[PDB]
């Protein structure tokens, strides 16, 4: 079957969890730090704000 998704989907769809600097791997975060001046990856990841 597969009937639902329920409540901790809110901290998995990133509307209540952590910044996109805490849930991303620290390799992709470092790459993003260093590449922001010719390619931007910041507008493709959620930041919850509660």
């Amino acid at each position: 079957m597969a009937t639902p998704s329920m409540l901790p989907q809110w901290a998995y769809m990133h509307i209540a969890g952590q910044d996109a600097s805490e849930y991303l791997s620290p390799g992709l975060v470092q790459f993003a730090r260093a590449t922001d001046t010719y390619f931007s990856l910041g507008n493709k990841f959620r930041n919850p704000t509660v």
């Binding site: 969890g17 952590q18 910044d19 805490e22 930041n47 919850p48 704000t49 509660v50």
Partner: peptide, 26 residues
């Protein structure tokens, strides 16, 4: 010039997944 200078010189810290910290502690 004509004077104003007041508190809150920088960003007010709040761990930006949320919008708070505390009232202090006691």
């Amino acid at each position: 010039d004509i004077n104003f200078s007041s508190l809150a010189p920088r960003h007010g810290t709040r761990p930006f997944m949320g919008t708070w910290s505390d009232i202090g502690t006691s």
